[PDB]
């Protein structure tokens, strides 16, 4: 057939480029970073009404100061999360401190290109890693299966990504509040989702310095959805 670590004539790794196509088929995940915190939101996308939607865990805690959202082949993310959690706690063991968000992200990305003929293929999932540390403050990173990670003020990944990213281009500014960011994620999720957005098929979360990483209740999100509808009807 052909090697797994083969370069194309354009200078790209075939398998890495193909894994990016799998991520485009994944459910939408959005992250927005502000000075009051970072907000993470996801589309759950249940395949059937009998599927208990609260068991869909696409937003995940790595440490008290670091959270993570995923899009693509979500099963691949479990070992990445396990490594991230281990790295975060191990650093706390060795250095009696919280680990930097960038350093955690770099540790996760080191796994990415450990494939060949190590694992047999790249990961088929992208991660939005959000967190806070004392040195660089509130941060949002996009971790790809290429081993590359970019920092973002705001980022969308998944099937409705380019449409959402264009929207995040216009809406984001450096003075956004946490409440404004919450509504903004809900607004853009509602725009790109196939089904109608509600508290059961969409999930919110945030990371603040005080309270740390928190996944939002369905009752709490439901109120933010109702607050969104009213403010859009206001003009």
């Amino acid at each position: 057939d052909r090697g797994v670590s083969t370069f194309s004539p354009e200078g790209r790794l075939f398998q890495v480029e193909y894994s990016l196509e799998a991520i485009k088929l994944g459910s939408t995940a959005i992250g927005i970073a502000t000075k009051e915190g970072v907000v993470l939101g996801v589309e759950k996308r249940a395949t059937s009404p009998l599927l208990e939607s609260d068991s869909i865990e696409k937003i995940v805690e790595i440490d008290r100061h670091i959270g993570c959202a995923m899009s693509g082949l979500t099963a691949d993310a479990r070992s990445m999360i396990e490594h991230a959690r281990t790295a975060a706690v191990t650093h706390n063991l060795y250095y009696d401190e919280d680990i930097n968000v960038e350093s955690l992200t770099q540790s996760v990305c080191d796994l990415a290109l450990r494939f060949g003929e190590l694992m047999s293929r790249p990961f088929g999932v992208a991660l939005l890693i959000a967190g806070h540390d004392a040195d660089d403050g509130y941060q949002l990173f996009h971790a790809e299966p290429s081993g590359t990670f970019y920092r973002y003020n705001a980022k969308a990944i998944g099937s409705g990504s380019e449409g959402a990213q264009a929207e995040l281009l216009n809406e984001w500014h450096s003075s956004l509040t946490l409440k404004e960011a919450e509504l903004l994620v809900l607004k853009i999720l509602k725009q790109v989702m196939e089904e109608k957005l509600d508290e059961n098929n969409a999930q919110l979360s945030c990371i603040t310095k005080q309270d740390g990483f928190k996944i939002y209740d369905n009752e709490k999100t439901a109120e933010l959805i109702k607050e969104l509808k009213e403010k859009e009807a206001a003009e």
Binding site: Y95, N100, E102, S103
Partner: protein, 111 residues
């Protein structure tokens, strides 16, 4: 039978002030009743405003300091030139020492 340990003597002293700290040590190095050196430095500047001294068996003391200095270097590389706090250095040194729990660095360490 070969004895991998030795005793190079010496004595060290650390005192913490309100906004300062001192780490002192004598410069004499010995074996048995002989003097090896009258001036052999024992207290070292390890970077990031941290000073260190490993007293007892000089060979193990030099190795530990050398490894910790190295640990500071790699802490900068891996964590974006972040300053290694004294509490973080202390915890790191605990793990350096326990790596040889069953063939110990024969030294009493102060930072």
């Amino acid at each position: 039978q070969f004895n991998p340990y030795g005793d190079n003597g010496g004595t060290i002293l650390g005192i913490a002030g309100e906004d300062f700290a001192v780490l002192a040590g004598d410069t004499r190095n010995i074996t048995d009743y002989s003097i090896n050196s009258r001036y052999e430095p024992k207290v070292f500047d390890c970077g990031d405003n941290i000073v260190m001294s490993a007293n007892g068996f000089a060979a193990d003391g030099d190795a530990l300091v050398k490894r910790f200095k190295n640990s500071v270097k790699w802490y900068h590389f891996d964590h974006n030139d972040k300053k290694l706090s004294i509490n973080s250095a202390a915890r790191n040194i605990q793990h350096l020492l326990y790596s040889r729990r069953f063939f110990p660095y024969y030294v009493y360490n102060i930072i």
